[PDB]
């Protein structure tokens, strides 16, 4: 019975990050462009793009 | 195949090198929430708890009962067994008495 | 309950996820949050992972009738009583500790939790789950009868010993809050309150300060400075609705309780059929109340198997 | 509730019996129990005979 | 869903009161899938509601 | 209102026909129509794992 483990998402509001391409059995990763988080107390990353 | 039996295949109980091909695919989060959305087909082994049929003992041919743990087919009724024996001369009774 | 089993929760604190339906049909930031549930027994004993730690007081001691949660980066407590789950009918809770609840619920197609708040405000979290276990045996019954036989099906334990599987926990990332800024007259005033607060002010000054005390700039407006509480000490579960702190490795570990056990169950028996013989056949008369299952096969070289769920008074040959 | 009618209830005390299902899934010797219920009526009416005075 | 309406509340003297009428309640779903709770990932589709003013 | 999306079905291309393999969990629609001068429309509420051509 399979079990798709998913970690916490990583986010950084100054620049960019990149992929890793490891060898986990069905590894699937992708980095997305300019987002805008909205955590509990207002906005999170303190910029807009 | 992603959805029919055996989409997660390992060579033995303690090993490595799984064969996950469940068609995993990621999308992008909607507007203003921190979440990771994805989409995949459900488990084949959870389809194979209810899509499996009856056991064989409901329709086995010669009225034989099929047990399971050291897999058996016990108490059939087919064919015939030949024998051959050799009893000693002390087991008989002589024609005198 | 051995009180030494909760020493793994000594540096742990609950969190606030994004349970996107709260009964009223709109999103929340609730304490309770159905992360994932999993069902791998056979008597239908599900196991639910929720965010609000139960059975532990604010200090970190095993008190039974207490549930600690979080509300605006501040610990609170609430009562273990008036906590229940229900899919489509109210169902019992059989043993629970930490993040984990072990229920017994009837079939439905949803699942919610709720507990009474310290200000008496019932807050909840529901999520679509299709619960329908296969009932043991060959009838379709609903209650236990007082007379029957024994049919096996597994279940979980009720022990809380640490057993070989775990979930990871890390340093919590950040809490941004616009409460900590204030603009009196040409001056932002970052109140501290007792927590290290980070800013990113870009008027003409420095944009890094881990100021554990109050600090003013006397040059910025409130639409230029942004507060964020940092450098915590208590770990929390690496949820998929809470962002990762940094791209380093694991840091903590807590065992998931209740390992597996086989068991049995009582199943009703159907009453004996009425037969009628007479020429190379038999005419059977059936009296079911809940739908049973008739089947037969031949004994020769070619069986002719047959099956049917019988519901009311019929007859077959 | 006629005070002359309840006067049979003098030497009668309620008991505890073997209930099959308490309502959670397991058995218990409960004070409340159903012995037998009847609808010799012809609509949805019952005369539940509880084991509790 | 369910095909009867019942509204009720406690009285000031702590007695449940209610009234119940025969009405067929089974709301048709908006979209092309019969879903129960709202998912955390999907599409927006126009519909009507009642404003809370 | 917010509404869930069904998963992408696994198709299989064959000679002048198309094998689709559907995986619903809550019931969805399935329509199609030809693009010529004679559509022959189809509709069905798919509920379980089925396979169509
Ligand atoms: C306190 O808060 C302020 C406000 O956000 C932060 O300051 C910003 O920091 C980021 C750091 O990445 C700055 O962004 C960088 O700007 C550089 C120069 O800016 C010109 O170009 C960008 C776009 O290239 C325009 O937006 C801008 O108007 C200027 O014309 C760029 O060279 C950088 O490019 C990087 O990203 C691009 C993708 O766009 C890549 O292709 C490049 O290779 C490179 O990696 C980047 O855009 C930003 O300008 C700063 N100011 C503002 C007002 O936002 C502070 O960082 C924060 N304090 C701390 C400690 O974090
Ligand atoms: C509910 O009840 C069922 C009843 O069967 C229990 O099922 C048994 O579970 C145990 C768990 O340990 C199984 O034991 C393990 O079986 C593995 C595979 O079985 C093969 O090998 C065994 C023994 O050689 C044969 O009997 C069997 O036919 C297969 O050929 C083994 O690989 C394991 O071996 C490990 O331990 C031995 C020492 O005993 C070492 O020498 C090995 O190197 C290895 O480390 C182990 O023996 C058992 O097979 C199951 N019974 C079956 C399948 O009939 C459930 O466990 C129980 N539920 C719960 C929750 O306990």
From Swiss-Prot, chain C:
Residues 26-29, 62-64, 184-187, 216-222 are annotated as: Interaction with host Mxra8 receptor. Disulfide bonds join 19-125, 22-28, 91-105, 153-265, 201-225, 203-220. Palmitoylated via thioester bonds. These palmitoylations may induce disruption of the C-terminus transmembrane. This would result in the reorientation of E2 C-terminus from lumenal to cytoplasmic side. It is found in: Virion membrane; Host cell membrane. Changing residue 207 to H: In strain: HuN1. Glycans are attached at residues 200, 262. Changing residue 122 to I: In strain: Isolate MM 2021. This is Spike glycoprotein E2. Changing residue 27 to S: In strain: Isolate MM 2021. Interacts with spike glycoprotein E1. Processing of the precursor of protein E3/E2 into E2 and E3 results in a heterodimer of the spike glycoproteins E2 and E1. Spike at virion surface are constituted of a trimer of E2-E1 heterodimers. Interacts with 6K protein. Interacts with host MXRA8; this interaction mediates virus entry. Residues 1-317 are extracellular. Changing residue 262 to D: In strain: Isolate MM 2021. It comes from Getah virus (GETV). Plays a role in viral attachment to target host cell, by binding to the cell receptor MXRA8. The host LDLR may also act as a cell receptor for viral entry. Synthesized as a p62 precursor which is processed by furin at the cell membrane just before virion budding, giving rise to E2-E1 heterodimer. The p62-E1 heterodimer is stable, whereas E2-E1 is unstable and dissociate at low pH. p62 is processed at the last step, presumably to avoid E1 fusion activation before its final export to cell surface. It is a single-pass type I membrane protein.
Curated annotation (Swiss-Prot), chain D:
It is a single-pass type I membrane protein. It comes from the Viruses. Residues 26-29 are annotated as: Interaction with host Mxra8 receptor. Disulfide bonds join 22-28. Signal peptide: none annotated. Palmitoylated via thioester bonds. These palmitoylations may induce disruption of the C-terminus transmembrane. This would result in the reorientation of E2 C-terminus from lumenal to cytoplasmic side. N-glycosylated. It is found in: Virion membrane; Host cell membrane. Plays a role in viral attachment to target host cell, by binding to the cell receptor MXRA8. The host LDLR may also act as a cell receptor for viral entry. Synthesized as a p62 precursor which is processed by furin at the cell membrane just before virion budding, giving rise to E2-E1 heterodimer. The p62-E1 heterodimer is stable, whereas E2-E1 is unstable and dissociate at low pH. p62 is processed at the last step, presumably to avoid E1 fusion activation before its final export to cell surface. Interacts with spike glycoprotein E1. Processing of the precursor of protein E3/E2 into E2 and E3 results in a heterodimer of the spike glycoproteins E2 and E1. Spike at virion surface are constituted of a trimer of E2-E1 heterodimers. Interacts with 6K protein. Interacts with host MXRA8; this interaction mediates virus entry. This is Spike glycoprotein E2.
């Amino acid at each position: 019975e399979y079990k798709t483990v998913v970690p916490s998402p990583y986010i950084k509001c100054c620049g960019t990050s990149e992929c890793r391409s490891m060898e986990r059995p069905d590894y699937q990763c992708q980095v997305y462009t300019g987002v805008y988080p909205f955590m509990w107390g207002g906005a999170y990353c303190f910029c807009d793009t | 195949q992603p959805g029919r039996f055996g989409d997660i295949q390992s060579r033995t109980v303690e090993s490595k090198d799984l064969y996950a091909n469940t068609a995993l695919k990621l999308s992008r989060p909607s507007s203003g929430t921190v979440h990771v959305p994805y989409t995949q087909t459900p488990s084949s082994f959870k389809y194979w708890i209810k899509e499996r049929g009856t056991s064989l003992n409901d329709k086995a041919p010669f009225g034989c009962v099929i047990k399971t743990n050291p897999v058996r087919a016990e108490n059939c009724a087919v064919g015939n067994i030949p024998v051959s024996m050799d009893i000693p001369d002390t087991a008989f009774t002589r024609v005198i008495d | 309950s051995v009180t030494e089993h909760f020493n793994v929760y000594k540096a742990t604190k609950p969190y606030l996820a994004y349970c996107a339906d709260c009964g009223d049909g709109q999103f929340c930031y609730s304490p309770v949050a159905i992360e994932k549930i999993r069902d791998e027994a056979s008597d239908g004993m599900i196991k639910i992972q929720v965010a609000a730690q139960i059975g532990i007081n604010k200090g970190g001691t095993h008190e039974h009738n207490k549930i600690r949660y979080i509300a605006g980066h501040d610990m609170k407590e609430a009562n273990r009583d008036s906590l229940q789950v229900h899919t489509s009918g109210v169902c019992a809770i059989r043993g629970t500790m930490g993040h984990f609840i072990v229920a017994y619920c009837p079939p439905g197609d949803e699942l919610k939790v709720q507990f009474q708040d310290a200000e008496s405000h019932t807050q909840a979290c529901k999520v679509q789950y299709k619960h329908a276990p296969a009932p043991v045996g060959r009838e379709k019954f609903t209650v236990r009868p007082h007379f029957g036989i024994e049919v096996p099906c597994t279940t979980y334990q009720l022990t809380t010993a640490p057993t070989e599987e775990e979930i990871d926990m890390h340093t919590p990332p950040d809490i941004p809050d616009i409460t900590l800024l204030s603009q009196q007259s040409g001056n932002v005033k970052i109140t501290a309150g007792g927590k290290t607060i980070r800013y990113n002010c870009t008027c003409g000054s420095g944009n890094v300060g881990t100021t554990s005390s109050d600090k003013t700039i006397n040059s910025c407006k409130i639409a230029q400075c942004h507060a964020a509480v940092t450098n915590h000490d208590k770990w929390q579960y690496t949820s998929s609705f809470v962002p990762r702190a940094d791209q380093l490795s694991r840091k903590g570990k807590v065992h998931v309780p209740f390992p597996l056990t086989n068991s049995t169950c009582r199943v009703p028996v159907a009453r004996a059929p009425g037969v009628t013989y007479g020429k190379r056949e038999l005419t059977v008369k059936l009296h079911p109340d809940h739908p049973t299952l008739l089947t037969y096969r031949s004994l020769g070289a070619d069986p002719r198997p047959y099956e049917e769920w019988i519901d009311r008074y019929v007859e077959r040959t």
